[PDB]
Design a protein around this nucleic acid. Structure first.
Ligand SMILES: [Zn+2]
Length: 251
DNA sequence: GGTAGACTCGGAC
DNA sequence: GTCCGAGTCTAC
């Protein structure tokens, strides 16, 4: 799921788990657990804690318990569900949090690719994976000035810059390509080559693109006409990623 | 100390 | 058998 979908998960999951107390934690793929590194310690420490809140940072979910925070990343295909302990698990279920009321929070992923870290709440923001995370794209902390300062300091492409979690939190490949199209900027442009005007426009389109999604021109549209000018959309590799752009609209 | 490479995984190709 | 996404860790 991308950032907007993670926000939807945050908002929908919270009422389904708030105030429930963890009775057991069952782990079927220990490698998902990144901290404590021992999955048995991860399970043991969560037992007895009640779920108090659920926040989002970038694409991370932060489950707030009594003492601890569980920080979860679903990557491309991870999913959460709340269901009865009496019913069979869905395929590819890797971690289950069992509550005292006979319900469960289940994490599944066909790709078996996500991560979980647990720390004392007061520590979570200063440990991986949250440490160093950049500002929320929809926050005033993500400003044209912040974007410009990062851009002038790097030799990297503008796409690489936007994909950098330290620059802006959880702005995915799809929204990078869409935002750059809407701003009229080629993804392979050196970040330092952008004018103040281009930076301002880019920031504006990033906020609009992700704001609209929480409330496609190019992504996956290679070979099809641009919706704005009719030129075939192209796909190349930029910053190690599939990259979609209109070679007329973007400069 | 900025930046690229290694590392996870399995469905699609 | 290879490709590919995110984000952390490793190493230059
Ligand atoms: Zn176009």
């Amino acid at each position: 799921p991308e950032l907007p979908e993670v926000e939807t998960i945050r908002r929908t999951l919270l009422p389904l788990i708030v105030g429930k107390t963890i009775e057991d934690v069952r782990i079927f793929w220990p490698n998902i657990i990144r901290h404590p590194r021992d999955s048995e310690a991860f399970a043991a420490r969560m037992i007895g804690q009640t779920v108090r809140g659920l926040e989002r940072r970038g694409k991370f979910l932060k489950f707030l318990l009594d003492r601890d925070a569980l920080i979860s990343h679903l990557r491309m295909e991870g999913r959460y569900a709340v269901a009865s302990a009496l019913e069979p698990l869905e395929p590819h279920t890797h971690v289950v949090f069992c509550f005292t009321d006979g319900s469960e929070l289940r994490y599944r992923d066909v790709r078996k690719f996500g991560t979980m870290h647990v720390y004392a709440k007061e520590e979570a923001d200063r440990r991986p994976p949250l440490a160093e995370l950049g500002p929320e794209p929809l926050s005033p902390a993500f400003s044209p000035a912040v974007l410009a300062e990062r851009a002038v300091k790097t030799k990297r492409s503008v796409k690489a810059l936007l994909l950098d979690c330290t620059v802006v939190a959880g702005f995915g490949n799809i929204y990078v390509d869409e935002s750059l199209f809407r701003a009229g900027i080629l993804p392979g442009r050196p970040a330092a080559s952008l004018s103040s005007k281009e930076i301002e426009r880019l920031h504006e389109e990033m906020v609009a693109t992700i704001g609209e999604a929480v409330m496609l021109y190019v992504y996956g549209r290679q070979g099809n006409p641009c919706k704005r000018c009719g030129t075939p959309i192209e796909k190349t590799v930029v910053a190690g990623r599939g990259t979609h752009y209109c070679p007329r609209c973007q400069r």
